[PDB]
Structures are given as structure tokens and as C-alpha cells.
Design a protein around this ligand. Structure first.
Ligand SMILES: O=c1ccn([C@@H]2O[C@H](COP(=O)(O)OP(=O)(O)O)[C@@H](O)[C@H]2O)c(=O)[nH]1
Ligand SMILES: O=c1ccn([C@@H]2O[C@H](COP(=O)(O)OP(=O)(O)O)[C@@H](O)[C@H]2O)c(=O)[nH]1
Ligand SMILES: O=c1ccn([C@@H]2O[C@H](COP(=O)(O)OP(=O)(O)O)[C@@H](O)[C@H]2O)c(=O)[nH]1
Ligand SMILES: OC[C@H]1OC=C(O)[C@@H](O)[C@@H]1O
Ligand SMILES: OC[C@H]1OC=C(O)[C@@H](O)[C@@H]1O
Ligand SMILES: [K+]
Ligand SMILES: [K+]
Ligand SMILES: [K+]
Lengths: 781, 781, 163
């Protein structure tokens, strides 16, 4: 039936040459179509699952996403009955024509990682997405089952394994699978007799003779399960055994964590440009991690002192902060230190703060210096290196290569999703955002790392209707630069979802009075309710008795706080039900940041346009997490809500913070918060793209709550439970240390195939990144 | 020898910080040493296998070459007993350090092709160097043996195989090994009944029913052997069967040869800058190749008209030549044409000749234009593409990539060997030679091609004492640009030695009188013996009865004609015995080539310095091979000899020409002629680095010949038999076409592993070659 | 099939090494000595041997180089003279590198192996005269008599040629 499909198509052309999201997609076409739709049926789905249509005049190219991870591309005539199948490169061809006027030059670069990944097969099942360590365990387990050449790497691994001059596991005496099999069995028999609680020092003497070094356990009971696991791996390997053994072998002692950009510190930084949850995340991470490391070290019978170093930039001139000092102890830990190294050039060190978009030229030299410094602090090399965001992941990759260390990366966000069509439009965006440098770093670190941690499933594969953050890096193009035909694969065994949490000492339910910090209420009240207008707070709240609609964030475009302010301003119904309180930007000082500056001006104007004085209180960055905990609980007291109107949010720690304090939450459905909140149960989703519907949705909530206050309680409890179930730090660290064990081993087994990819990546860095980065204009002191 | 060994190192530090070459790095050290040698002990063996030694402060680094293609690097302490093994990358550090003062940036490019080549096992045997098709034959032979997933590709090959819309071998009626097996047997039974001479047309009707298309053979007999061959590969594959069948399948019809630089023509060219044996080789090659292709096509029962196209630059302003016409029939062929295409920029075409060292920025646009043109000429696409030298290989690679055609490359020379230390010292050489472009292209094509042809073993692996031309490319560095850790491997199965020849109608023994061309004797005598001095010839021969010491060649630095002149000028013994005649340079015109100009100035000076008038005749470029043949023969008449005093010579076609006419030849021991000539038997070696001995050797030969004239005749016969045995064109074409058969099929089997290497090279071209080439300044018309 | 199984499989070559390693007759060792425990050493030894031999005149008798070979792990049975010892060592190198059916057959054919042969023909009246035509006594007896004569000649020929 061609009279119909041509209906939609002729409507497609009516739009003119440009990109169209499924946002528009059928919006303009199928629903916006005349009642003649009468479709359902075939070709409705094909269009329903269409992620984007690139429309140029004769043709429209369609990218179709049947399942997460599965993609087919199609060209169909604007006027015709014809439908042809595009190869990914060919569809990327369409995009390039839409922008440059021409497809990229014949011999212009195609990035393809697919042929480099043929080492392990790949899962086709939705269940292994973000689950890759499970798949890997099952592959290793099989590859290991009665293969002498397969088991050897394990023996060599345990044989060479050591820390700070001291030998661990097997000694040099065990040279072959037989001797090992024999020693284990002999050792098993000896211990099987002894009392469970016998300390390793008793049988230490005996073990050393037969070739066993320390780290099997603190006492005989533990050592026995350990030695039995290994006998089991040499006999009949299965995944649970494998994972347990590898996760248990003490490995991680010295950890190195990379976060170069922003002002990274424990006080008076939160909410400055570039300074946000990534800092909050890491500080929570190290503490949870140190606790777990000590625990492990002890259990395996070791006295080793751990060290965790967070490498960031030293900022000499940032005053009111500790950013200018080389070494800083992380609060509430023995072994975690922030290590700070300066950016520098041939001219000497660079003093001023630099935006995260501008740091690229300094990253390589930073890697060199960082290597020297961490090497002065550590005893022995790093056992694990974790990259964070783009610059951190970049540096993390170089260091891991340099030092021969298991690497992990964490994106914390991927700009390509936050700035829609920033890939295809990169050129016009480059003087400002330098996304050519950044998308290069990302693609690079993504493939270079050993394993990857994400905060949610959606960060990888998205949902049924919409594409994930990484998934969107599978096929893209930067016209005039290069074309990524397969840049990453959602099914990659290196992806692991491990969810973060909020420090439970800082954020707890507002209902526990014993724990409420009331010593903060005077300050909070001045902050919320005072009549003073200054750099700390703008306008004033007329009625202190209303519920408060609250948000807190860095102030930039994507965070879209000026959007919220507008939605709020237009809607009389909502302004009547609730006061709007927004924490963002720091007005105490001169903003050096582009987006922030821009956003500040919009805020001012909105205040005048919608005459917001008396309903609205605009607060400066709140840098003390302890008082913030209380602030959230205070919002609860007023029976209000948290709202997060980001155009895109990669994860959203404040969403978790609010829910954890019992504050009912309305969060953007674009990005992580879609997975975090279960609509109508643990909170509500709103669409930043329809803000008036958002404001009405909030007005609705507050109206119901007024009629039936128990409505409020439902959501509050809903959120509280959701957090308890999904996001908390206890499991995280154990999960991470286990992945490091398994991926660490897999490194040596898979070492020979990754050799080509290693060289390919080295060249990409050298001949693509470096030149791009050197083109970025230097900061001038 | 804690005493003795320390002692050599002693002298070593003497020469200071510098390059240590075997001659220097031994001849000085050990022979300028004392009787303290007593060196028939072990340390001398590793000592004399040292190819070069990097002299620095207290360390000296040694590259050691026990056997051809086997290298180990190490560092010894200048004053110390300690010697520590070095990785290839580390050895190359030293060189980088000795020049720039620092190593290359830690993260700057390191090329390693090793991991990309693992597809096949590699021969460790000297015997397989240059023999790789024999090796690939045994790999495929084995991979093929009772493996179904293995045999399918061969069936897909034969089924898909067609030319110009005409099906060949198997039709679509054969979908699987079972039916193929069944059909062949059926065909066999039928054919064995018929008379041997039965033409394919008779049984064609039947063959088409059972799925057999044309190309098995012209008669019953031949069709029978081919069918039996294939049945064999389905049953018991062996290397000989495999090779023979693959060589027999009609494949090569359209052939494209790439030779952009020089003035490429059939007359009024040879001896111009850049115009040389490459032009000669190619013209002979195509003729030989056409005769074989026609042969094959006939034998396999086909009427196809073949085409061979030689692609070169169109030069509109080169007068006296055919170089400005687009299409030129090659003398003595029906199907071979020269196809010229212009260089151009956005500004339009570029008219003026450009030195082979400067062509780089034009090649990519050249490739595009050339694809358009050769597409107009060919009916169907190229079945084979052959690259020639650096530019030709660069373009051939782009083409084969673009058109999906089997690719061969032929180096014809590798400048890195011709210009010692031009890699390490490349930077100061670059404004003139652009070796950064060239070496990049060479490494690029070298790894990109399917198979490589060389003219001699030495060209690949050299000798026991000296390093091969390609081999010298295994590990090197260009400080400040990049470093090649493994760039090529002498044991690579793609290397094939296929030796060229001299056209036998042009060059033949001086003793066959019926054939001598006497009508040229008037001209020749004027050339050598006349008293006129002009741009055609300089100075004069006083005594017409002396033997002549003859050389002919392009005039450039490496050809070292000026060296010969000096050796001759100094040596009174030789001047007395013989007249020196040198053909090189075209003085008829004003030289546009740097080295030529430089070299002319020296020649003039040498004439006056050594007062060469009356013993010396300097002749301008002799451009007609027909008379040239007679020229050689005329030298023989005088009982003279040929001398090739090159500092390095990649092959030496003139050596073959000379030997083929019965002219006793003295050729440089550096490069190819070392293999061509067997000293004392088929000719003599001379060392351009000791020139005075060169002149004495010549002197000795002439002296002995004066005493015993049969000495001359002895060497003459040596040369002739030598040529007869090794270098002739008859075997060449068959060899080439069999290689295409075998490497063509290998393409389809090995396709998946070379996919990784394909991306690596693609990225290397894009990100390394293009930027370099775009930096070479353009010619200005 | 052997040519294939043999191509670049270490595990698959070991059998060949062991074969030539144990091979001996009447207490005298043949081919490889006990000195060679692995393929790398054999590779190296065969290499060294080839090099040494290539220099000596074709007609040089084994005893000359017997001393050296003994040193490096090479026992007798390679050939009578240098020329033949050379060809045989090359064949073996070839099998270690790129095994093919012709080379395998040729090398295994040439290894001195068969010395004592035992032939079974129990029934009939088996003899050289006054037998043929008797019950059960016929072409089989004729066959075996011709057979052994021919065999003996070839065996002597082979034994001599292998040194
Ligand atoms: O003015 C501010 C702005 C942000 N934050 C904290 O910074 C983190 C922001 O993390 P999130 O993931 O929500 O946003 P991000 O900045 O990382 O994109 C949360 O802990 C906030 O409570 C804060 O304490 N004061
Ligand atoms: O003035 C000259 C110089 C060279 N030749 C021919 O050019 C070829 C030179 O090839 P060769 O391999 O000897 O040196 P190349 O120029 O390739 O380095 C030979 O056929 C020579 O006879 C010639 O005919 N006239
Ligand atoms: O009276 C006889 C009968 C048989 N023969 C020989 O016995 C052999 C018979 O062998 P054959 O293969 O013909 O048949 P077989 O007896 O072995 O079944 C031949 O060499 C005959 O010459 C013979 O010499 N005299
Ligand atoms: O850590 C979570 C946040 O961090 C940093 C970002 O840019 C946000 O989009 C994320 O949600
Ligand atoms: O290959 C033919 C000639 O071409 C180019 C050269 O430099 C010579 O050495 C060769 O012999
Ligand atoms: K150990
Ligand atoms: K076919
Ligand atoms: K033996």
C-alpha cells in the first residue's frame, strides 16, 4: 500500500534537509498525520523504532533500532516505493552530506574497532549487557577446562605474583601443573586435620618448604577453601569457583584514581565550574574502597599498608581552597590521599583554572609528571588505575600503558549525548567546546581500558525506546574529521554496571529526629527565608509556610535551571502551591565559565520577566555536604519536592541524595534518572522538552498532597526503598575488587590478541589525539 | 676474556660519539688492535656479526646479526664487564638520543606490524626467504585437508569467478561441496571416453547442464587434467597440486602497472633524470607478460582480449618525447598501452616535470584521476595491479584498496639503503629529498600489498656478512617523527624472487656476426673516436686501439660516475692499459635535476685536475636501446670491460646487459650486483669505498688479458652462462601469473585476519602519509 | 595427512624427534643421539651440521666429519658421503619447517630401517626344487623366492648408501 507510506514521506520532505529525532519522527508524521494513518500493522513498527531520520531532498536515511544493541540502516525514496539497505558506513555518508555538502574524502579515516574485538565471541543476549564479567567468567571457565596450555597462565600468574619484594601464593619451586597439583593436595591434607582457627604462622614453616607463600588466608579454615578452589580450577572449572578464587587472591594494594579537571577538594569547592558529583563520587568511592581493601588484606593473612591516590590538578591561585597543595588526606580515612600535580609547558607551570573543555593540550605532560609523583608516594607500582571522565580516562590509559597496570574507566558522562548533534555539528562547536579532542579521547579510552564501570544499564544500552550513552558511540561521524563505523559495542564483555550511592552518614531520612542536625536551622532559615538580597541569595520568599520546590546543581546549559525557572514562572497554579528555591552558580565571585555566565544572565532576566520576587529564592553554590544533608531534610519538613530538569543527566547523584533523605523527586527522563526512578512509585519522570507539562505535573502532585497528605508519604517511602535496593556503597567496592581480579587475569590470557588493538590505539592517540590537542589554544597567565 | 674483551671496548670509546659501521666498528677496532686478539674464542663471533654500533658516553649499543633475518640488540658498558640485552625499541632509543639528544616523545608513534602478520606461521629457514609462495602453498595445502569450512571458499571462488559478464569454471547450479564433487566425477567419466583433441565446444552443451562453465581447457585432454586436479584438492591437497590448479584457472586479463615519475617513454628518454632501468624493466615486463596471458587464455579455451595498461604522468611540456600524449601503443605488442594522466591541483593541471623526490603531494589526486581513466580504457576491472617504486607502490595500494584487486609491489630500489643514515639523519635531508614521505610510503605499500616481487635474494635478506635491502627496514627510526620496531620481516611469505632479464633481440653475444648491426658502426666510431667536442661528447681519445673501460648510467650521486673518473685519473697503470668512456648526463640541455648538476661540475673539474684529455671520452645520454646493444658489442670488440662503480645499486640491469653481450663486467659489491656476479667466474666485484683497489683490479685484469687473451674469453663465457641460468624473461611471466593465482585465492581465505591490518594501514596513510605529503611544497608553473 | 598434521604443530613433531632419537640397531645408535632432547636443539644442530657440510667437497667420506657430528648429537645413518648427508639433513629441516608429502615420503623412505626381515609361509612344501606343482605349492613359493632376492639387493644398496 504505497499511497500511505508516500503520505508520510512527502511529509518528511516538507520538513527540508536536516536531522530528525524520533522525538519529531512520527510526531510530525504519524500522529500529526491525517486520520488516514489507520495503520498499526507493518511499517509502523519500523518507523516506531526509528532512532533518527536524516532527510535530504531525494532520499531519507533511517537508523532503526529493533532491540538495544541491534541496529539496521535504510535508505528510502522521499517520492518512490523503494527501500534499500545501508551499511553503517553508507548511512554515515548521508550525515556527512547533510553538513559539509559532500561525504568525507575517499581516503579520509574510518575508525573500526570491530575486527580487533574478535578475540572473545560476543554475547547477543540483553542480560549480559553491563554483565560482562559473568560472560567472561563462563568463557574463561570453559577455556580453562582440561587445557594444560590453558591452565599454565594461571600458574605463571600465581607464581610471579608478588608485592613490595615479598612473594605471594606460589613460590619459584612450583614449575608445572603437576608439582602444583601435588603441592595443593599435600597442603590440603595437612590442613584438613588442624583446628579451624589455627593461625597461618603455625603452618607457615611447612608451607614454605613445599612452595606455598602467604595470602591463601589468615587461618587454616580460610586457607583450606582457597587451596580447594584452586584444586577445583585445575580439575573441573566452573564460573562461580573461578570468580570466587580470582576475586579472593589479594591483588589490589596501591590504587591510582585520575580526575584532573575542576577544583577537586573536600571543602569550598562544590558547584564551581566543572566541580560536582564526579568529586562527590570519588571521595565516597575511595573511603568505601579502603575499608574493603583492609578487610581483604587481613582475611588473606597479610600486613600490607594500602595507599589510594587521587591524581588531580594543582591550582596555585584558587583561594579559599586546598587546591594549591600537593598532598591532602581524605577525611575519615587512613590511607587515601589527594595528590596534586601542576599543568605545565616549556614556559613553566600554568597557574589559572582551565575549563574541562580546554585541558587537552596539557594532558600528556601531566601524565609524565603524575607518573613521577605517584611513584614517590607509592611503595611498589599501582595495582589498579581508574580513569574518570574524558581527561581522566585519557590520562588513565597512558599511565596504564606506561606502567603495565590493569585499567578501569568511568565516564561519569559522555558529552556527545549531552550536546545533541555535537558530533555531526562538531566543527561549528569546536572553537568553544573542542569536542574533536574530547570525542577522540573518549573513543580511545573506551577501547583501551580493561574493564568499564557504569552507574546504570541505560548509560550503556539505554531503554527499549531510546539509545544508551555508550550505545550512541557505536556508529557516528565527525564530517571533515573522521568516521567511526564501529566505535564501541553495547555487548562488550568489558562493561559492568556497578551502582554508586550517597554517604549514609550525610544523607538519611528526614524522619529520624535523633540524627537531625538542628544546629544548622538558623543558617538554613536565613538562607531560605531572609529578606536580604545579595550574592548569597536573590529575591525573597513572601510566605514561609508554603512547601518548597527545590533544586541544587552546577549552573550550566544542560543542567537547565533557567528552564525550570521559566516553567515555574509561567504557571500560576504551581507558583500558588509552592515556593521555588534553586541553588546554582556562585555569585560571590566573578564567573570565569562560559555557560555559567550565560545561564546567570538568563536567570536575572527570568526574575524580571515573570516577576518572581516573593515566590522565588535563588541561592549560591552550597559547598558543605553536611549542611546540605540538613537542607534536604528541611525541604522535607515543608512537605515539598526535589526537581531535576536537565536536558540530559548522565547519572544524577542529587536524585539519589533527595530520595535518600525522603524527599519526593521529579527527575528528567533523559539519561540516568530514567532508570533510577520508577515513575509513580519511587518518584516521577518529567520531560525537559515539555516544561509546561512538567510544571502542571508538579502542580498536580502538590494538589493531591494537599487533599491527601499521605500521597506525599507514599512517594517518600517509595524513594527510600528504591535507594536501599539499588544504590549503596557497601556492595560497590567488593564488586570492583572482584572485577580487578578477574580482568587482571584475563589480561594475561587474552594478552596476545589485544596486541593488534593495542598498536592500533597507540597510533590513534599519536596521530589523531596529539595533533588535535596541540591545536587547542593554551591558557595565558 | 675479562682482560681481552675490556680491551676492544677500550679502543671503541676512542672514536667518540658517532655511528659505528661494521667496517669501521671492526676494521678499526680489531685489526688496529694487537696480537692480544687470541680471538678464536667466542667473543669474536658475536663481535664480527655486529652490523652497527652506537657510540655514546659510557654505553655503546650493538645491533647483532648472527644469520640473515635474525637480529639481537644489546648494550655493553664502555668501562665495565656488564652487557645487557636490548629490546628493538630500546636500541632505537640510542639512535634517537645520539641525534636529537633525547629519545622520541614517550607517547609518539611506534610502528609494529608484527602482530598484524600472525595469520600464517613464519618460516625460520633461509631457504624460504624469497620463496614464500612455496610456504603459503603448504599452509593452504594443509589448511585444506579434509576441512569443509576450509574448502567452501575455493568453491565460492570458482562459482563467483567470471569476466566481462561471462561465467567461468563453476555455474550457480553448484551450491555445495557435495554437488561439486558429484559433478566433477560425472564430467571426468564423460571426458575420459572422448578423443584427446576433442574441442571444448563438442562437450560444452553437456558441461552446461551439469554446471560447468568455460575455462577448464581448450580440448578434452586439458579439461580432464584440470578436473582431476580439483578433485585432488577436494580429496588429498598437496602443495604442487594446489599451485598448479590455481595457476591454471584463467584469472589475469586486465593488468594495471603504476609508474608515475620520470619521463616514461619508448624513445628520447633514457638517461634523463629519474628515467632508467625502471622504464626498461616495465616495457620488457609487459611484452613478456602479454605473450603469456594470450597463451593462458587460449589454453583454457577462451577468446578474451587482454589489456595491460602502464599508468604514468602526462607531461605536456616535454619536447622531443611522446610524454604528452594520453595513450601510446607499446612497441611489439597488440594489447599493451601506456596511459598518461596529468598531475593537478585545485588550480588545474601541472605541466612541468617534477623530481621523483617531490611528487608526493600529487599522488592521491593522481590515484583518483587514474581510476577514472583506466576505467574508461578497461572492459571490466583490473585483475592485477602492480606497483613500481615508491610512488607507484603508494598509488598501487590506494587503487587496489579502492577497486578490490590483487596487488603486487616491486621496489626497484629502496632509497633508505642508497642513502646511508638517511633515516636517522632524515631531518636535515628533508627539504631536499622528503624521505619522511618516501619511507612512509615504502613501509605503507610494503605491508599493504598481497605479494612482493624482488630481483634477487640480496634485495630481501642480503648476505651472511651484510644486511638486505628490505631487511634494513625491519627496525629503524626517524628521530622526531616516528620509530619502526618491526616494519617488515625478511621471512614474510609474500616475498618472491622473480628475476628479470635483458631483451634478447636487443642484447646478444658480440660474437654472432650475422646479427651485429653494422650500419651503426659509422655513428659509434664518431661517438667514441671523433675529435669533435660538444654537448654530445667531451674530450677525445688519442689512441683508438686501446681497450675501452665502459660505463653507461643516469648521472647522479649514488651512481658515482665521478668516483670512477677519479679512480681512473689517479691510476697510471690503468690509464696506460685502457681508455675510459662514460655515458651519463644529457648535456644537450640545461639540467633541471640537482644531483645531475652537482655531478656535472665534478666531471668537468676531474677532467682538468687529472688532465684526462686523450684518455677519456664523456658521452651524453644514449637513448636508443637498439644502438645501445651494438655499443656494448663494440666495446667487446676492443676487448674492454664494463664497470659499475655505484656506491649502492639495487639491481643493475646494465650489468645484465653487459654480461649478455659478452662484456666482462666489474660491478659494485654494494646491493644487487653482489648476487648477480660470481667473482672470478661470471665477473668481478669491486668496492666503491676502496676505489684505488678498484682501479688496480681493473689494471690487473687488463694486464692479464694482454698476457693471456683467453682470460678475457673465460670471463665473457662466465657472464653469458650466468645470465642464461638466472636472469631471463621467459620464466618470469609464468611465475608472475601463478603468483597472482595463488595470492588471489589466499586473499579470500585470509581475508578476516588481514582486516585488522587493513585498518591499521588505512589509519597510517590517512594520519601519517597525507599530512606529510601535503607539506611538500608544490611545483610552480 | 601426515604432511598436514605435521605442519606447524610442535606436539605433532615430537613423535618424529623421538622416533629418530630411539632409533638404533644392534646396540649402535643411529640418526640422532640421546643428546638432543627437544626441537629447538635439533633445529640448531641440523643447522650447524648443514653449514659445516656445505663447505666440504661432495665426495668427502662420512668418517671425516664423524668426529664433529658425534659431538653435536649426530649418529650414523645419514649417508655414506658428505653429498648424501647433506641432502638428508636438508630434508629433515624441511620437515620441521614446511612438511610436504614428497619430502616426508622421501625422508622416511631413506632412513635406514629394515635390516632383519621375517617372512611367513607355513603351509605347502616350500623349497627351491622338486616341489612346484605339489598340493598347496605354487606361485606363492615362486613369489617369495623372487621377492627376497630382489629385497636383499635393495637392502644392501640402501645400507651402503646410508653409511
Ligand atoms: O551547589 C552545589 C551543587 C552540587 N552539589 C553536589 O554536587 C553533586 C552533584 O552531582 P550530580 O551527579 O547530581 O550532578 P553533576 O554535577 O555530577 O553533574 C551532588 O552531590 C550535589 O549535592 C553541591 O553540594 N552544591
Ligand atoms: O644514458 C643511458 C643511461 C641508462 N640507459 C639504460 O637504462 C637502464 C638503467 O637501468 P639500471 O638498472 O642499470 O640503473 P637504474 O637507472 O635503474 O638505477 C639500462 O637498461 C641502461 O642501458 C640508457 O639506455 N642510456
Ligand atoms: O607343475 C607346475 C605347476 C606350477 N609351476 C609354477 O607355479 C607357479 C604358479 O603360480 P600362479 O600364480 O600361476 O598360480 P598359483 O599356483 O600361485 O595359485 C608358476 O610360477 C608356475 O610356473 C611349475 O613350475 N610347475
Ligand atoms: O556523577 C554523575 C554526574 O557527574 C557528571 C555529569 O556531567 C553528570 O551528567 C552526571 O550525572
Ligand atoms: O629494476 C630495474 C632498475 O630500476 C631502478 C634501479 O635503481 C636499478 O637498480 C634497477 O635495476
Ligand atoms: K608468587
Ligand atoms: K563462475
Ligand atoms: K638414535
Amino acid at each position: 500500500n504505497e499511497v500511505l507510506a508516500l503520505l508520510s514521506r512527502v511529509e518528511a520532505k516538507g520538513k527540508g534537509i536536516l536531522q530528525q529525532n524520533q522525538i519529531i519522527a512520527e510526531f510530525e508524521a504519524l500522529p500529526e498525520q491525517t486520520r488516514k494513518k489507520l495503520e498499526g500493522g507493518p511499517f509502523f513498527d519500523l518507523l516506531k523504532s526509528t532512532q533518527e531520520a536524516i532527510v535530504l531532498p531525494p532520499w531519507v536515511a533511517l537508523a532503526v533500532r529493533p532491540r538495544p544493541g541491534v541496529w539496521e540502516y535504510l535508505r528510502v525514496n522521499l517520492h518512490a516505493l523503494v527501500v534499500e539497505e545501508l551499511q553503517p558506513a553508507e548511512f554515515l555518508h548521508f550525515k556527512e552530506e547533510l553538513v559539509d555538502g559532500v561525504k568525507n574524502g575517499n581516503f579520509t579515516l574510518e575508525l573500526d574497532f570491530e575486527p580487533f574485538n574478535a578475540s572473545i565471541p560476543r554475547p547477543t543476549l540483553h542480560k549480559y549487557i553491563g554483565n560482562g564479567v559473568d560472560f567472561l567468567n563462563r568463557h574463561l571457565s570453559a577455556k580453562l577446562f582440561h587445557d594444560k596450555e590453558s591452565l599454565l597462565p594461571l600458574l605463571k600468574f600465581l607464581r610471579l605474583h608478588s608485592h613490595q619484594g615479598k612473594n605471594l601464593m606460589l613460590s619459584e619451586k612450583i614449575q608445572n601443573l603437576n608439582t602444583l597439583q601435588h603441592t595443593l593436595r599435600k597442603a590440603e591434607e595437612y590442613l584438613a586435620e588442624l583446628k579451624s582457627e589455627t593461625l597461618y604462622e603455625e603452618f607457615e614453616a611447612k608451607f614454605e618448604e613445599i612452595g606455598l607463600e602467604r595470602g591463601w588466608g589468615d587461618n587454616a579454615e580460610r586457607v583450606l577453601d582457597m587451596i580447594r578452589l584452586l584444586l577445583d580450577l585445575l580439575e573441573a572449572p566452573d564460573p562461580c569457583t573461578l570468580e570466587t578464587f580470582l576475586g579472593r587472591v589479594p591483588m589490589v594494594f596501591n590504587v591510582v584514581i585520575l580526575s584532573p579537571h575542576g577544583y577537586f577538594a573536600q571543602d569550598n569547592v562544590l558547584g564551581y565550574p566543572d566541580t560536582g558529583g564526579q568529586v562527590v563520587y570519588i571521595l565516597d568511592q575511595v573511603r568505601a574502597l579502603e575499608i574493603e581493601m583492609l578487610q581483604r588484606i587481613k582475611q588473606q593473612g597479610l600486613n600490607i599498608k594500602p595507599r589510594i591516590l587521587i591524581l588531580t590538578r594543582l591550582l596555585p591561585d584558587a583561594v579559599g581552597t586546598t587546591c594549591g597543595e600537593r598532598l591532602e588526606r581524605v577525611y575519615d580515612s587512613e590511607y587515601c590521599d589527594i595528590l596534586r600535580v601542576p599543568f605545565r609547558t616549556e614556559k613553566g607551570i600554568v597557574r589559572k583554572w582551565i575549563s574541562r573543555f580546554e585541558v587537552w593540550p596539557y594532558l600528556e605532560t601531566y601524565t609524565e609528571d603524575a607518573a613521577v609523583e605517584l611513584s614517590k608516594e607509592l611503595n611498589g607500582k599501582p595495582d589498579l588505575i581508574i580513569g574518570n571522565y574524558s581527561d581522566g580516562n585519557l590520562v588513565a590509559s597512558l599511565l596504564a600503558h606506561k606502567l603495565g597496570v590493569t585499567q578501569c574507566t568511568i565516564a561519569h558522562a559522555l558529552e556527545k549525548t549531552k550536546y545533541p548533534d555535537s558530533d555531526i555539528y562538531w566543527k561549528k562547536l569546536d572553537d568553544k567546546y573542542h569536542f574533536s579532542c574530547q570525542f577522540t579521547a573518549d573513543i580511545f579510552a573506551m577501547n583501551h581500558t580493561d574493564f568499564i564501570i557504569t552507574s546504570t544499564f541505560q548509560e550503556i544500552a539505554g531503554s527499549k525506546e531510546t539509545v544508551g550513552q555508550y550505545e550512541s558511540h557505536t556508529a557516528f561521524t565527525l564530517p571533515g574529521l573522521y568516521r567511526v563505523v564501529h566505535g564501541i559495542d553495547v555487548f562488550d564483555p568489558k562493561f559492568n554496571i556497578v551502582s554508586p550511592g550517597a554517604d549514609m552518614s550525610i544523607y538519611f531520612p528526614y524522619t529520624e529526629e535523633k540524627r537531625r542536625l538542628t544546629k544548622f536551622h538558623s543558617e538554613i532559615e536565613e538562607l531560605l527565608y531572609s529578606d536580604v538580597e545579595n550574592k548569597e541569595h536573590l529575591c525573597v520568599l513572601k510566605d514561609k509556610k508554603k512547601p518548597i520546590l527545590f533544586t541544587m546543581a552546577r549552573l550550566d546549559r544542560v543542567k537547565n535551571l533557567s528552564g525550570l525557572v521559566e516553567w515555574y514562572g509561567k504557571n500560576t497554579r504551581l507558583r500558588e502551591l509552592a515556593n521555588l528555591v534553586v541553588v546554582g552558580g556562585d555569585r560571590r565571585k566573578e564567573s570565569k565559565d562560559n555557560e555559567e555566565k550565560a545561564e546567570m544572565k538568563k536567570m536575572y532576566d527570568l526574575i524580571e520577566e515573570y516577576k518572581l520576587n516573593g515566590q522565588f529564592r535563588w541561592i549560591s553554590s552550597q559547598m558543605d555536604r553536611v549542611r546540605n544533608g540538613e537542607l534536604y531534610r528541611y525541604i522535607c519538613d515543608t512537605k515539598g519536592a526535589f526537581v531535576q530538569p536537565a536536558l540530559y543527566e548522565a547519572f544524577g547523584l542529587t536524585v539519589v541524595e533527595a530520595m535518600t533523605c525522603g524527599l519526593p523527586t521529579f527527575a528528567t527522563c533523559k539519561g540516568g534518572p530514567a532508570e533510577i526512578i520508577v515513575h509513580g512509585k519511587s518518584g516521577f519522570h518529567i520531560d525537559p522538552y515539555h516544561g509546561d507539562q512538567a510544571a502542571d505535573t508538579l502542580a498536580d502532585f502538590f494538589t493531591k498532597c494537599k487533599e491527601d497528605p499521605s500521597h506525599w508519604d507514599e512517594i517518600s517511602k517509595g524513594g527510600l526503598q528504591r535507594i536501599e535496593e539499588k544504590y549503596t556503597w557497601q556492595i560497590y567496592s567488593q564488586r570492583l575488587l572482584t572485577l580487578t581480579g578477574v580482568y587482571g587475569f584475563w589480561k594475561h590470557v587474552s594478552n596476545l590478541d589485544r596486541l593488534e588493538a593495542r598498536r592500533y590505539l597507540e597510533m590513534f592517540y599519536a596521530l589523531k589525539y596529539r595533533p588535535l590537542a596541540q591545536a587547542v589554544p593554551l591558557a595565558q597567565d
